[PDB]
Amino acid sequence: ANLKQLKIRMKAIGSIKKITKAMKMVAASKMKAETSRLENGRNFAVGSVQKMLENESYVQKKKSTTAPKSTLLVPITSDKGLCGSVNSSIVREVKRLALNNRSAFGLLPVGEKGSSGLSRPFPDLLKSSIVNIQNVNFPTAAAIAHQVSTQGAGYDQVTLIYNHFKNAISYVVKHQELLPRAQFLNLFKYVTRHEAVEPELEYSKNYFFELYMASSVYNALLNSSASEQASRMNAMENASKNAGEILSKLTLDYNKARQAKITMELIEIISGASI
Amino acid sequence: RVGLTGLTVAEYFRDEEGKDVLLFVDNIFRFTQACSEVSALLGRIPSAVGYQPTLATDLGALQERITTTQKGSITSVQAIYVPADDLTDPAPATTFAHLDATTVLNRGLTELGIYPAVDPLDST
Amino acid sequence: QFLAPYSGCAIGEFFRDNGKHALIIYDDLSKQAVAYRQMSLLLRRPPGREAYPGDVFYLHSRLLERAAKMNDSLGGGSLTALPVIETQAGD
Amino acid sequence: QFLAPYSGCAIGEFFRDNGKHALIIYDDLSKQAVAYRQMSLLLRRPPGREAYPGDVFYLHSRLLERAAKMNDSLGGGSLTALPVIETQAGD
């Protein structure tokens, strides 16, 4: 069946499996660094502001306990494609929670795929996004926390959607809920159990707000970045697996076509030699 | 017919001596190939991929004369060469139909210092 | 090899025509096609696709077509067939 | 089927040699080769590759080569050919 065409398509699958197999190696190499970076940066000042605020008894007595009617969603996704199904899951969950009720979420995306995938379903809702992050570090994550602070004044709540890197092969989507600056300052000024006199409360309230916001942001990026390489490695493994299976199947058909070719040509030679 | 020559020498010990014989035969591909060459020269129309129409008969004779009898037995350890790496080729295909066991020799094991060439997994 | 299948089938029709039941089993029939292909090629016949004769279909059909279930008036006998085929690469 | 293409081509040469313009449309030529192959095979001629005769190339070439744009000295006529070919699987 036109052996020349089959042998070409078999060559293409071989290259795909090759490059697919190579990207898997890089996926594991980068996952190693992310895991090393995550383990070193994880649980950094996480829950600290939450713990002390809970330790503040007088604050809880006067804590304004209401349900935020309008919140801000900041999903975290990878910018490079062919990273796995983690991006599809994040854009899927936010799509469900957003498609249900519209005009109640700002939906500031993070990552090319996260923003691109949510551009068409939610036009006029997402206005800006962050992409092309050179590296993950606290100074950068703080700049991201500031941008969310500027856009969080309009909404009564802020939450981040990202993948949680619980295992090298298991990444579960996890979402944190963070209150805006306005609610935090009004809530923080009631702090009385923990003295703040070295810097005055008017300054400490704003400074500790950044720590409360950047810590969650910085932690989420690591979990998502680690899940990216983890999900990418698995994707290349499954992709390379499928590439090999198909390549082997075509090899059988190529041999079958080879036998038919010899049979066809051989009968022609015998037909001419008969007469 | 050189393959049958060794078989005849073995059949002597099988029947007369009544003792077990071990018949080593070079890769059967050249055996089946010679049968195809002689067939073409004699003027017989070749098979699908050039083999002789008497492949089953020519090969069945050798594969059947090698068995266990009441007087003795002739165990044949013959190599198998797959032309063009095509397992569906008539020569290896018809041969596998008769083979009871297969001894696959692996090159990797030799490098590690282990020098039984037989592969434990590939062998069946 | 070409005649053995038909010889056994005739033995089964005996029980079929006498109201009895018979189950004839045919080993791999690819051996028959090779055997019939041998005779065909040796007869200088024109080979078709895969070097098999054009009448290879009628070869197997005429055999399996004789295995059926006779009515009750003729005896009610039957003749079950279990033809076998060997696939090289499972295609 | 073997002469119909050349037959219609002759009708076109009339307009061609008379300074006129004619458009001839040959339907599937593979069917002509089958008829020309059949006509040649039945004559007990040695077949070529794919069972077609050796001069099958000369068949279509002789037919299509007639279509041309005559010079003004002969009237300036022209014959345009639009042969059709049917492919099995786009090969």
UniProtKB/TrEMBL annotation, chain A:
Topology in the lipid bilayer: Peripheral membrane protein
Coiled coil (residue ranges): none
Cited SUPFAM superfamilies: ATP synthase (F1-ATPase), gamma subunit
Superkingdom as given in the UniProt entry: Eukaryota
Keywords annotated in UniProt: ATP synthesis, CF(1), Hydrogen ion transport, Ion transport, Membrane, Transport
GO terms for cellular component: proton-transporting ATP synthase complex
Pfam family, one: ATP-synt
Record's subcellular location: Membrane
Molecular function as annotated in GO: proton-transporting ATP synthase activity, rotational mechanism
Family: Belongs to the ATPase gamma chain family.
PANTHER family in alphabetical order: ATP SYNTHASE GAMMA CHAIN, ATP SYNTHASE SUBUNIT GAMMA, MITOCHONDRIAL
NCBIfam families hit by this protein: ATPsyn_F1gamma
Oligomer and partners: F-type ATPases have 2 components, CF(1) - the catalytic core - and CF(0) - the membrane proton channel. CF(1) and CF(0) have multiple subunits.
The protein's name: ATP synthase subunit gamma
Lineage: Eukaryota, Sar, Alveolata, Ciliophora, Intramacronucleata
From TrEMBL, chain B:
Localization of this protein: Membrane; Mitochondrion inner membrane
Source species, domain of life: Eukaryota
Residues annotated for ADP 1 binding in this entry: 115
Protein's job: Produces ATP from ADP in the presence of a proton gradient across the membrane.
Subunit structure: F-type ATPases have 2 components, CF(1) - the catalytic core - and CF(0) - the membrane proton channel. CF(1) has five subunits: alpha(3), beta(3), gamma(1), delta(1), epsilon(1). CF(0) has three main subunits: a, b and c. F-type ATPases have 2 components, CF(1) - the catalytic core - and CF(0) - the membrane proton channel. CF(1) and CF(0) have multiple subunits.
Family (UniProt): Belongs to the ATPase alpha/beta chains family.
Protein name: ATP synthase subunit beta
Span within the parent record: 250 to 373 of 497
UniProtKB/TrEMBL annotation, chains C, D:
Residue sites binding Mg(2+) 2 per the record: 27
Subcellular location: Membrane
Superkingdom in the source lineage: Eukaryota
Coiled-coil spans in chain: none
Function: Produces ATP from ADP in the presence of a proton gradient across the membrane.
Family recorded in the similarity comment: Belongs to the ATPase alpha/beta chains family.
Protein name as annotated: ATP synthase subunit alpha
Portion held of the full protein: 274 to 364 of 546
